[PDB]
Ligand binder design. Structure first.
Ligand SMILES: N[C@@H](CCC(=O)O)C(=O)O
Ligand SMILES: N[C@@H](CCC(=O)O)C(=O)O
Ligand SMILES: [Cl-]
Ligand code: NA
Ligand code: NA
Lengths: 249, 248
């Protein structure tokens, strides 16, 4: 059986609700759990889902250049696959492999409706409304590495207030938007899930970039290209779209 | 130096307009030519651009299983790369390799404005308005293979009328929409180029599927993963976005 690392993130991966105790893979449900099941149907592998220990997606540390999160688990061969909303990025592709994308997305802004804020630039040009992102994720890394003035300014702001504006999880960021004057830089796919359930919230502006979620594998894994082929089949059959419809309702 | 196969298709690849006759790589410009130039800078290769001889993207003969177009050029190792609006598909990924996508898109419908036609289903349930797609491309292949009722029905319509409703190129299909009661199934990226320039035309409905364009290589090529990393570099620095804005 393949060891599959993943992370709790609605509506991709969550704990299934039952009146009775649940065990093994049956504990989990969500878009990525359905994806994993479909991949196993096509490719014929068995698997064991395990939540990532540190609860992080994956980032490289400045000083010791060590990785954390699901990325680290693949690097160290503690997992065979990462099936999660894991963004395919330049720096990650240098240390792990990824299937082709099963979903495409971009960074955008989650905030309230009816305000004068209409873009990242509007946030960058002020300090009254705090804004931030998930710590040690692809969104934070985008801002940290950007040479675009607007985003460079936004990183300077977030970095100098790390403790107060960066959050541990999307759920924490979403809660901050709901309970304080705060705008959250996060992925558009997940924004769509939030805005269909919270009618006072909206995406602000467009997509700031473009990226895909892919299944992660250790570098050189033979499963990478097989999973790509299975994803392409599921897309063309209309199955990924049905799965998106099911979980984003 | 690498041999790069490609295909004429606005605004991805076109012949540069000029008074002085042009030679070799100078003959070409477009989104995909800019992409090729950026990839060459990052990876440090030189290249010769050659248009695909048979003028096709690539499909498999369903009797003997032989391929044509750019896909065939890669299979036969007649080109090192295909840099073009070449859709990454299940059937192609089994015979060639692709970089990760530099652009994402989906099949949709090009038609005229002001009608009650709002979806593929609306087209499928009638015959007065003819519809078709490019022969031997990914869009046609999607319909040919689909188990989805509506799309299976549309394939029955298109295949039975192959001579009259399938076209050799996007340009031919677009001209048909402009000059007759015809709706053209084509890729949303290319629709966007067209509707920005022809105000009487519009996309009908949403995306019917989702796919990306990738740089093609022969199976097992070491350039594949290198080009993926270069594409990710270009995306992250904002260049792919600037490239699309320039050509659209
Ligand atoms: N999906 C992101 C985490 C969330 C975010 O950074 O917005 C990643 O793969 O790192
Ligand atoms: N871009 C398509 C051709 C055009 C189409 O099929 O709509 C391909 O790669 O085959
Ligand atoms: Cl790949
Ligand atoms: Na890699
Ligand atoms: Na392949």
């Amino acid at each position: 059986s393949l060891i599959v690392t993943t992370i709790l993130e609605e509506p991709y991966v969550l704990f299934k609700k039952s009146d009775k105790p649940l065990y093994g893979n049956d504990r989990f449900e969500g878009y990525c759990i359905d994806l994993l099941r479909e991949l196993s149907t096509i490719l014929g592998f068995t698997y064991e889902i395990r939540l990532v220990e540190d609860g992080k997606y994956g980032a490289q540390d400045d000083v010791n250049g060590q990785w954390n999160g699901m990325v680290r688990e693949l690097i160290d061969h503690k997992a065979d696959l990462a099936v999660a909303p894991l963004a395919i990025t330049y720096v990650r592709e240098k240390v792990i492999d990824f299937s082709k994308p099963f979903m495409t997305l971009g960074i955008s802004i989650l905030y309230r409706k009816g305000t004068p804020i209409d873009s990242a630039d509007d946030l960058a040009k002020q300090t009254k409304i705090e804004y931030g992102a998930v710590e040690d994720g692809a969104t934070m890394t985008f801002f940290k590495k950007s040479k675009i003035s607007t985003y460079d300014k936004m990183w300077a702001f977030m970095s100098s207030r790390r403790q107060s504006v960066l959050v541990k999880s999307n759920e924490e960021g979403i809660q901050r938007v709901l309970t304080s004057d705060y705008a959250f830089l996060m992925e558009s796919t997940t924004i769509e899930f939030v805005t269909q359930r919270n009618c006072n919230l909206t995406q602000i502006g467009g997509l700031i970039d473009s990226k895909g979620y892919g299944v992660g594998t250790p570098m050189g894994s033979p499963y990478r290209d097989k999973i790509t082929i299975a994803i392409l089949q599921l897309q063309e059959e209309g199955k990924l779209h049905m799965m998106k419809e099911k979980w984003w309702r």
